[PDB]
Coordinates of C-alpha atoms and ligand atoms in Angstrom, one line a residue:
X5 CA -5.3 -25.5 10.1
X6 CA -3.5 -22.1 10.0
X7 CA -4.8 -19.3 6.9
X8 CA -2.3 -18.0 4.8
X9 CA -2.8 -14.1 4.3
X10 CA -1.9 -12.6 1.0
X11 CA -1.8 -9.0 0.1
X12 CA -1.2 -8.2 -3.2
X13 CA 0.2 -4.3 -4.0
X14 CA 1.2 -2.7 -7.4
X15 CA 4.6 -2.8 -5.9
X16 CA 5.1 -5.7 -3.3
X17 CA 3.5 -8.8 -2.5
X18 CA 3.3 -9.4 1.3
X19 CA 2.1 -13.1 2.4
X20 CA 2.6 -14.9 5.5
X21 CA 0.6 -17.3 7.6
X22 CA -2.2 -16.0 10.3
X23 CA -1.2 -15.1 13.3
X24 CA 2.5 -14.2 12.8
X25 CA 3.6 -10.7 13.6
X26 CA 4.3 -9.7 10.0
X27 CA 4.7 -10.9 6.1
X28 CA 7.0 -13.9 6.1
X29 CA 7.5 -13.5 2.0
X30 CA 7.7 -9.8 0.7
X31 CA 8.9 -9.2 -3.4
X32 CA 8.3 -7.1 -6.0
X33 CA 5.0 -8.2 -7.6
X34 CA 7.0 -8.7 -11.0
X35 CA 6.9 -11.5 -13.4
X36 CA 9.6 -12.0 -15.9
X37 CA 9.5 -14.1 -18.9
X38 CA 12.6 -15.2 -21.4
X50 CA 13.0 -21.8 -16.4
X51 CA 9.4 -20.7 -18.1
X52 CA 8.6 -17.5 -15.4
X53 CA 10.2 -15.9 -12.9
X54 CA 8.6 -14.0 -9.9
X55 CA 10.1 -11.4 -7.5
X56 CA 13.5 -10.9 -6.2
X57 CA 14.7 -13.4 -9.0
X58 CA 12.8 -11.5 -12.0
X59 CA 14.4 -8.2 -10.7
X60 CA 17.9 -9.4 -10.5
X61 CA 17.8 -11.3 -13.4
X62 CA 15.4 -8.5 -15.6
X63 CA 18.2 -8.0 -18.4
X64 CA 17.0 -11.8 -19.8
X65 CA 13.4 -11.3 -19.1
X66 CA 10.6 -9.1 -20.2
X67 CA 9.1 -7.9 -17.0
X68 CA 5.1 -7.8 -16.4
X69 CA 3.6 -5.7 -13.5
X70 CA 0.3 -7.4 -13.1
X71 CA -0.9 -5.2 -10.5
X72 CA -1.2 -1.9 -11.5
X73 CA -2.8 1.6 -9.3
X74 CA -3.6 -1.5 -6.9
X75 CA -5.8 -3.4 -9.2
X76 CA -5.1 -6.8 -11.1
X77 CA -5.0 -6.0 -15.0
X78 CA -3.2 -9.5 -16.4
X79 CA -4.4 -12.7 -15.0
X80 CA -1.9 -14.9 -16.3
X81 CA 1.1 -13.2 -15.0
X82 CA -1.1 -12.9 -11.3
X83 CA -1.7 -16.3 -11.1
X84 CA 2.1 -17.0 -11.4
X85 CA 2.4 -14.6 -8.8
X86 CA 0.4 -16.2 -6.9
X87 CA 2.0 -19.8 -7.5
X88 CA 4.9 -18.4 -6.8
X89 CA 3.7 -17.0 -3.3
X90 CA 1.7 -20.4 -2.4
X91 CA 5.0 -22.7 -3.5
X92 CA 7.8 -21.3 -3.8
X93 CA 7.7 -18.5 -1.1
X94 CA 5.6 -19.8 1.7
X95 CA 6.2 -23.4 0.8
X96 CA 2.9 -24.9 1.0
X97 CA 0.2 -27.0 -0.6
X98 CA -2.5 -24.3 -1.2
X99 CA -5.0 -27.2 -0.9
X100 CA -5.0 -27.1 2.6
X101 CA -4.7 -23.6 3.7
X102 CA -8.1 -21.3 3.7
X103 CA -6.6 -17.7 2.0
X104 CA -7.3 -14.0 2.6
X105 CA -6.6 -12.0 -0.2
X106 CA -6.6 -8.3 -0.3
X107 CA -8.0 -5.6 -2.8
X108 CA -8.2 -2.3 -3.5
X109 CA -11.0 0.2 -2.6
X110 CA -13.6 0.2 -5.5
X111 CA -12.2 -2.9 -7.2
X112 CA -14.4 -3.9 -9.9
X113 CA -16.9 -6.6 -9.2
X114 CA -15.7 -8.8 -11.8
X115 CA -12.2 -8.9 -10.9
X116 CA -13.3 -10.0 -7.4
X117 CA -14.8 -12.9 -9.4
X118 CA -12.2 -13.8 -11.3
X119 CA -10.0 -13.9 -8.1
X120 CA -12.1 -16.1 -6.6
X121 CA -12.2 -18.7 -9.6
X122 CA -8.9 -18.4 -10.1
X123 CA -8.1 -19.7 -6.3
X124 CA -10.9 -22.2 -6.6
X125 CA -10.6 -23.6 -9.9
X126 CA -6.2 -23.5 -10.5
X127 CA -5.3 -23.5 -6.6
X128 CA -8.1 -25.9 -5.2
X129 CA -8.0 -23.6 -2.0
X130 CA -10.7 -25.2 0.7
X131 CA -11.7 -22.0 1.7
X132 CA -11.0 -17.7 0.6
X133 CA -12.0 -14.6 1.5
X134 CA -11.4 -10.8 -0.3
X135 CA -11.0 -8.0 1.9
X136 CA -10.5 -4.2 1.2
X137 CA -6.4 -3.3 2.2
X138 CA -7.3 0.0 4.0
X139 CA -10.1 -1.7 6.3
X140 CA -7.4 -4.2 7.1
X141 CA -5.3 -1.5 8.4
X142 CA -7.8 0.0 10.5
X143 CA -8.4 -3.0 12.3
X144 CA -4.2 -3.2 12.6
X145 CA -4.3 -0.3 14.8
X146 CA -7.1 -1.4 17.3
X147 CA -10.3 0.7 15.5
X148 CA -13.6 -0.4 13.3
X149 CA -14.1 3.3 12.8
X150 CA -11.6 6.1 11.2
X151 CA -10.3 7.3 8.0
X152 CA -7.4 5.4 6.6
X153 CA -5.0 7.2 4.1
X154 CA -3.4 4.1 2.4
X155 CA -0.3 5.2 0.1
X156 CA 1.7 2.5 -1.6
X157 CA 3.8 2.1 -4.4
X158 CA 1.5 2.6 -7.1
X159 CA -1.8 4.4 -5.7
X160 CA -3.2 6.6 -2.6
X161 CA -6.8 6.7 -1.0
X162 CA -9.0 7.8 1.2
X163 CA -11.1 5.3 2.8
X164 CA -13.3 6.8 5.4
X165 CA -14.4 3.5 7.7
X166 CA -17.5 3.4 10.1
X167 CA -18.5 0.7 12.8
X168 CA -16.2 -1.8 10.5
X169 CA -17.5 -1.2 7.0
X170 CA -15.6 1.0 4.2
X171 CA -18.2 4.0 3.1
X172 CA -17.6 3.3 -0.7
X173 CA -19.4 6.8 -1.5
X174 CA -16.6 8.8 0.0
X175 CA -13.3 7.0 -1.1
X176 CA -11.1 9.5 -3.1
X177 CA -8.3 8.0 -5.6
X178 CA -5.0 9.2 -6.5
X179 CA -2.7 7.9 -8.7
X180 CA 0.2 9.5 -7.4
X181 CA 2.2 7.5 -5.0
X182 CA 6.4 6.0 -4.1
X183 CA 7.1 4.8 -7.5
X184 CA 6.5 8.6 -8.8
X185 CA 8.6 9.8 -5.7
X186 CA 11.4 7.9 -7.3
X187 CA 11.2 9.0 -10.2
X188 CA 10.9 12.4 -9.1
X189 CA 14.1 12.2 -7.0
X190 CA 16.0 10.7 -9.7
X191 CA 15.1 13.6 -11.7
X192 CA 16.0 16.1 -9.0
X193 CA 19.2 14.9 -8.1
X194 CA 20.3 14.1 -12.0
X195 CA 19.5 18.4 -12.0
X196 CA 21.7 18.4 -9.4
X197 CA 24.5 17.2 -11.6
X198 CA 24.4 13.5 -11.1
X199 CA 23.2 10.1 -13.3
X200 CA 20.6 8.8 -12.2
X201 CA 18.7 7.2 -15.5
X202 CA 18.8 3.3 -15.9
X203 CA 16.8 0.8 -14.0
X204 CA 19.9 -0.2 -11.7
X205 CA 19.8 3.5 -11.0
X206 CA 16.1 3.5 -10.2
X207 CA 16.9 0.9 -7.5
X208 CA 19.9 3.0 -5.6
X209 CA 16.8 5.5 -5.9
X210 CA 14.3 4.2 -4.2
X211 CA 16.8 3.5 -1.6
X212 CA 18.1 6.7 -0.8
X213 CA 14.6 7.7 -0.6
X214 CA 13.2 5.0 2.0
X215 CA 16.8 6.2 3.6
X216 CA 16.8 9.7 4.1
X217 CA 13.7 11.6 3.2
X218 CA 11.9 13.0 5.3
X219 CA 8.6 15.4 5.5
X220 CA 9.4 18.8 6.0
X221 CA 6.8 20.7 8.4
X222 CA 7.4 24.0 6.5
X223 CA 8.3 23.9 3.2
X224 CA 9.5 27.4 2.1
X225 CA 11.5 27.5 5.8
X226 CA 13.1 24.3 4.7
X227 CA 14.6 25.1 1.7
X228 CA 16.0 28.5 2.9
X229 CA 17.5 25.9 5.7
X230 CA 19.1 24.5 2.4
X231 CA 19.9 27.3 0.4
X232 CA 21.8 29.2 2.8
X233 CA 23.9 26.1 4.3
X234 CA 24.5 22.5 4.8
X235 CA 22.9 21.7 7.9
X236 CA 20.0 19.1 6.0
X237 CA 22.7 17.6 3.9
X238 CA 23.3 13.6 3.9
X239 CA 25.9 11.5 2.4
X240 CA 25.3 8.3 0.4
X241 CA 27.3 5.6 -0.2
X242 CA 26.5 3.9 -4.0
X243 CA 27.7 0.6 -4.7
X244 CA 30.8 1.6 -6.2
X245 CA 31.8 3.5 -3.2
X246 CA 31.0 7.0 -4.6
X247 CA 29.6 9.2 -1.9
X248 CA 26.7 12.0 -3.3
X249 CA 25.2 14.5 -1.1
X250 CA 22.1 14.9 -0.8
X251 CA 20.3 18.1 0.7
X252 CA 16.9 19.8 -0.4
X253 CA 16.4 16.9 -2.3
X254 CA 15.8 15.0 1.2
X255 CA 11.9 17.0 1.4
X256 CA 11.1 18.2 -2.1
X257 CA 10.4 14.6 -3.1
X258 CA 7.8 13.9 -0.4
X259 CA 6.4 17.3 -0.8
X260 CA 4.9 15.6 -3.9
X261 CA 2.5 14.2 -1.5
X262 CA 1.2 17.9 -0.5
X263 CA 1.7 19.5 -3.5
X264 CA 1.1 16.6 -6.8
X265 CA 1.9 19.4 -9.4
X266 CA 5.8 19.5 -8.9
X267 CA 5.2 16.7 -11.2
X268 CA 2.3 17.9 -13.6
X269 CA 0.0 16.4 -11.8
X270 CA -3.4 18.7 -11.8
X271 CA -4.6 16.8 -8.6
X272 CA -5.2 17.7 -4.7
X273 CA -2.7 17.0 -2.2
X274 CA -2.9 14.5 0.6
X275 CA -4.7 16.6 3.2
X276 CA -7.1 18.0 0.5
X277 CA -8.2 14.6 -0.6
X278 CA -8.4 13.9 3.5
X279 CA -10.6 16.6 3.7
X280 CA -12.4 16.4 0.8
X281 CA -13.2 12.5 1.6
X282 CA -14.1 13.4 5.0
X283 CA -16.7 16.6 3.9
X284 CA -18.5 13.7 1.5
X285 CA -19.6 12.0 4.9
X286 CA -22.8 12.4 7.0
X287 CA -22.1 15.8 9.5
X288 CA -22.4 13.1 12.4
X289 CA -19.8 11.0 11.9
X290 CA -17.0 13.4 10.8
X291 CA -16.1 14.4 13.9
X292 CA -15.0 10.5 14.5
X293 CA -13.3 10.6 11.3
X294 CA -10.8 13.8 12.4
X295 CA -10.1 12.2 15.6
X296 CA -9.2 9.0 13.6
X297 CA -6.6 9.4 10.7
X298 CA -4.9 6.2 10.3
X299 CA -1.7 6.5 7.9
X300 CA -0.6 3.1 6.3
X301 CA 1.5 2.0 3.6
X302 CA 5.1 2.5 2.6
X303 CA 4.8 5.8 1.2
X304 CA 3.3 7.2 4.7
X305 CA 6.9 6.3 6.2
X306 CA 8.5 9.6 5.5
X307 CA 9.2 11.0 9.0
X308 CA 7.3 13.9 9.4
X309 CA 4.7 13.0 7.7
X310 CA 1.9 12.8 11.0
X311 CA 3.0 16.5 12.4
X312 CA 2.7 17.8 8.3
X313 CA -0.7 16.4 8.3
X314 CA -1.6 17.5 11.4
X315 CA -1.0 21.0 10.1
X316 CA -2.3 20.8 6.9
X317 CA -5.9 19.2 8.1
X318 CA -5.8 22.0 10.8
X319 CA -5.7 24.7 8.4
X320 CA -8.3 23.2 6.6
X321 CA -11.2 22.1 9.3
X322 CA -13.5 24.3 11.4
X323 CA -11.1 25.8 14.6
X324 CA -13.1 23.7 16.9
X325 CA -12.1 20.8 15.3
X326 CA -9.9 17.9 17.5
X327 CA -7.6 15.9 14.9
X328 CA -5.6 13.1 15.5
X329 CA -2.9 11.7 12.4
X330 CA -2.1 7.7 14.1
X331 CA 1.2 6.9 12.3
X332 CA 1.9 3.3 13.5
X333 CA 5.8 2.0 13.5
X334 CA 4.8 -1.5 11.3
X335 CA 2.3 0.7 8.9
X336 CA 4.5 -0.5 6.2
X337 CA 2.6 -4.1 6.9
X338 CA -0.8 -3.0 8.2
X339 CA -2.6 -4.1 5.9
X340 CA -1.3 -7.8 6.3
X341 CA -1.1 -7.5 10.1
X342 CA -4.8 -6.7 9.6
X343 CA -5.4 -9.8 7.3
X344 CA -3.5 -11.5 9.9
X345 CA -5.5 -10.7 13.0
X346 CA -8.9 -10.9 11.0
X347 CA -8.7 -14.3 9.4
X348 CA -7.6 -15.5 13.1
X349 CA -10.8 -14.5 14.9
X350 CA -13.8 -16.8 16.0
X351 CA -16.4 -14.7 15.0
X352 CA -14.9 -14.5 11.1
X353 CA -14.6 -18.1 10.4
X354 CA -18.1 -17.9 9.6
X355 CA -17.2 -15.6 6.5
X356 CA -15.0 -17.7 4.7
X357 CA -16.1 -18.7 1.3
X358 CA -15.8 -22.8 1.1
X359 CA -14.9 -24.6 -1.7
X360 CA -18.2 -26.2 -1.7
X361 CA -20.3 -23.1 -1.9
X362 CA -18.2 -21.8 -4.9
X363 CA -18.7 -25.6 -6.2
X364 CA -22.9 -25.1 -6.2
X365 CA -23.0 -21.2 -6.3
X366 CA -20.0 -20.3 -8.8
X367 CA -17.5 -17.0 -8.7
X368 CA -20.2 -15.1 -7.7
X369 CA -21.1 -16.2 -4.4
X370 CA -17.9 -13.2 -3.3
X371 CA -21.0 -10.7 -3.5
X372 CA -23.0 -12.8 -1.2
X373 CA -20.1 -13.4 1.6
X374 CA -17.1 -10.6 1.3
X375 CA -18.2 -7.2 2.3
Ligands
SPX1 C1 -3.6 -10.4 19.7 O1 -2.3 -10.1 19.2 C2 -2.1 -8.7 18.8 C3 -0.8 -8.1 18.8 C4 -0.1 -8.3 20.1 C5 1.0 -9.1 19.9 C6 1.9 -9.5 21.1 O2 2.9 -10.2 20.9 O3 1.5 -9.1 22.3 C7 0.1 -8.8 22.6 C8 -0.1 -8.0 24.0 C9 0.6 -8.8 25.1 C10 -1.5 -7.7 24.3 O4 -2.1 -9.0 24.6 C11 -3.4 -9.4 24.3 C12 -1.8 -6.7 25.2 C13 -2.0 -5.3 24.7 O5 -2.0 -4.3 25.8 C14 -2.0 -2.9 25.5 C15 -3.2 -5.2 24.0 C16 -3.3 -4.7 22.7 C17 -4.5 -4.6 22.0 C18 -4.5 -5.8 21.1 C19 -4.7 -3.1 21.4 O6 -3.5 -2.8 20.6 C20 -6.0 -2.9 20.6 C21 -7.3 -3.3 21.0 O7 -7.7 -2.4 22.0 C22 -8.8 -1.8 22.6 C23 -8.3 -3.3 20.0 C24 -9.1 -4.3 19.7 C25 -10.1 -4.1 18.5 C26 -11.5 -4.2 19.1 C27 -9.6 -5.2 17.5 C28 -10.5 -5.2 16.2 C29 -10.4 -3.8 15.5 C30 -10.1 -6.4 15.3 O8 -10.3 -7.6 16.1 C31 -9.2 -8.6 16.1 C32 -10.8 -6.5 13.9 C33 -10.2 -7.6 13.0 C34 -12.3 -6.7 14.1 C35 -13.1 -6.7 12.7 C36 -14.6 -6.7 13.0 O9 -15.1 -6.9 14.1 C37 -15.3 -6.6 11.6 C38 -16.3 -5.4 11.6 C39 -16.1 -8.0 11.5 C40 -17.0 -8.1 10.1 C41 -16.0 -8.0 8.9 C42 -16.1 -6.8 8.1 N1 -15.3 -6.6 6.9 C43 -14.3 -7.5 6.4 C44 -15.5 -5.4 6.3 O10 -14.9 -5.0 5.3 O11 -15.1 -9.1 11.5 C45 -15.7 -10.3 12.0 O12 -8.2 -4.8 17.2 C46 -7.1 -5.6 17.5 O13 -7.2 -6.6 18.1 C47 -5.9 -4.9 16.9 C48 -4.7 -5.4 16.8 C49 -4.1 -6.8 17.2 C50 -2.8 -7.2 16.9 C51 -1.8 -6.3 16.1 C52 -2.7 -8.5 17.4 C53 -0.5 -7.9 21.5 O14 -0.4 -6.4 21.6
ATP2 N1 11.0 3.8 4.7 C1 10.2 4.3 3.7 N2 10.2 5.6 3.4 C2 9.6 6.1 2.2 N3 9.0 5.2 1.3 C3 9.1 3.9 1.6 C4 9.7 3.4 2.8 N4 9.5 2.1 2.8 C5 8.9 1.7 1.7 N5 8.6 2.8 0.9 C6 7.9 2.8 -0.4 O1 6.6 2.2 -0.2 C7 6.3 1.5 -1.4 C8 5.8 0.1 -1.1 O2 4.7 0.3 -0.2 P1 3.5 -0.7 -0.1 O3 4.0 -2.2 0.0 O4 2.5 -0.3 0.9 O5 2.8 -0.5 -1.6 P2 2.1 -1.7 -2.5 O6 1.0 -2.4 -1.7 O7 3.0 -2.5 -3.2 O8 1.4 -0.7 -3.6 P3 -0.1 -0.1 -3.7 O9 -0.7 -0.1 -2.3 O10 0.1 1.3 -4.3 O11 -0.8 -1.0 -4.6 C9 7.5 1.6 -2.4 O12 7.3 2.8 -3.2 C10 8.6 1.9 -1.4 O13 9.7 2.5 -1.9
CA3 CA1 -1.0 -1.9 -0.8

């Protein structure tokens, strides 16, 4: 009997089956409502009929109802299965609330009848995607960024840090930047071409300040874009001062630390021992770590920050984009976890809150 693995993000649902290489079924985690529902690529392309819900938001779930179409949708319609027979992972965020791990767990025993779930933490997941149980994941998606420093397997909940700055606010940034620049871009057709040019041709620059006199002074960092229509904008500084965002959150009012600040920070709240474990083992994951450039810019920033006998290493892996899931994946596969699994007749005797006693 194969587990399905289903990781739920504030921008993009990712589910597939244990043991493939990656998300069969990935779609906007957006439910549209005038059929009854719509979920995903349909709600999106269909949004001028529909009032769109985003049940997921900074990583956790804040409206049941529309989550448990998402999740009908991802059982039925996307994986095509009978959720009855497959035992599910599901994925949360660091520090998600006690009772919405409950609720999750209800909600998959008492609507979906699964035989068997489990509720893991996303950025632990993408540790164990790239081979380690120890090492401090930066996990950066479309709605939220952490820190989640990681030790012998288990998260240090103590020393997670929390931003709320992540790809759907470099999007809007660069629609702002290049509408400065004298184009459109304003509606939510707009915001789509957006996000595109962004996953297409930004890029971290190493020095900022060098970088834009690279830009000021001639076209050498300029791209061209095709839109839809055919008309072809140019895009130049635009390219690094929208993941610079990362570094440097008040380009958009934002009174918060950076990326490598909060890296630092998260590391510095950990026991002396262990730290130097943690510098040697920054994992990057999640779409918004994607920006090449990103590992070397870290790399820098982290030096300039820890003591000079200090060895760092940033692990940028190719699929980070799915980590998490491939995590899920590769967890819910092995012997020694199928102990873990929460059955449908313990939740039967002990109720939703048997996930205390058994995830973790
Ligand atoms: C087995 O298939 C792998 C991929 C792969 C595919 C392929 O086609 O080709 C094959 C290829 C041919 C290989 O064949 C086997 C050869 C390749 O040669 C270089 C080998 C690759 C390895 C897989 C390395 O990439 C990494 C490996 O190296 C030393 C690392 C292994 C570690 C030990 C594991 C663990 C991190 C991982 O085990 C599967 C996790 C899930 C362990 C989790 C635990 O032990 C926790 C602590 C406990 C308790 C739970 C705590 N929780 C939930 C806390 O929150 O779980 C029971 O980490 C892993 O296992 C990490 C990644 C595995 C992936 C992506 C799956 C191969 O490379
Ligand atoms: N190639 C890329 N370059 C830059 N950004 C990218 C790239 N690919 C995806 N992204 C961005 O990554 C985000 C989706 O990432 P991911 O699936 O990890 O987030 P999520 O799980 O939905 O959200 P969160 O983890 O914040 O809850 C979107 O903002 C998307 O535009
Ligand atoms: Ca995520």
């Amino acid at each position: 009997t194969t587990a399905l693995v289903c990781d739920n993000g504030s921008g993009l649902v990712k589910a597939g089956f244990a043991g493939d290489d990656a998300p069969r079924a990935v779609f906007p985690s957006i439910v549209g409502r005038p059929k009854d529902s719509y979920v995903g690529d349909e709600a999106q392309s269909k949004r001028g009929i529909l009032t769109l819900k985003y049940p997921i938001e900074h990583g956790i779930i804040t409206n049941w109802d529309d989550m448990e179409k998402i999740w009908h949708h991802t059982f039925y319609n996307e994986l095509r299965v009978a959720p009855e027979e497959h035992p599910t992972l599901l994925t949360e965020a660091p520090l998600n609330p006690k009772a919405n791990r409950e609720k999750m767990t209800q909600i998959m025993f008492e609507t979906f009848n699964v035989p068997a779930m489990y509720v893991a933490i996303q950025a632990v997941l993408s540790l164990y995607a790239s081979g380690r149980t120890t090492g401090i994941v930066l996990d950066s998606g479309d709605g939220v960024t952490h820190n989640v420093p990681i030790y012998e397997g288990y998260a240090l909940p103590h020393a997670i840090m929390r931003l709320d700055l992540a790809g759907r606010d470099l999007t809007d940034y660069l629609m702002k930047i290049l509408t400065e620049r004298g184009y459109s871009f304003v509606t939510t057709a707009e915001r789509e071409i957006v996000r595109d040019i962004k996953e297409k041709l930004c890029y971290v620059a190493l020095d900022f300040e060098n970088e834009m006199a690279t830009a000021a002074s001639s076209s050498s960092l300029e791209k061209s874009y095709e839109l839809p229509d055919g008309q072809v904008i140019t895009i130049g500084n635009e390219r690094f001062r929208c993941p610079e965002t990362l570094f440097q959150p008040s380009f958009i009012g934002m009174e918060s630390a950076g990326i490598h600040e909060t890296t630092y920070n998260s590391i510095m709240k950990c026991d002396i021992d262990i730290r130097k474990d943690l510098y040697a083992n920054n994992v990057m994951s999640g779409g918004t770590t994607m920006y090449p450039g990103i590992a070397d810019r870290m790399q820098k920033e982290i030096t300039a920050l820890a003591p000079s006998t200090m060895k760092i290493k940033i692990i940028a892996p190719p699929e980070r984009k799915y980590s998490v899931w491939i995590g899920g994946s590769i967890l819910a596969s092995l012997s020694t976890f199928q102990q873990m699994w929460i059955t449908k007749q313990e939740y039967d005797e002990a109720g939703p809150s048997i996930v205390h006693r058994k995830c973790f």
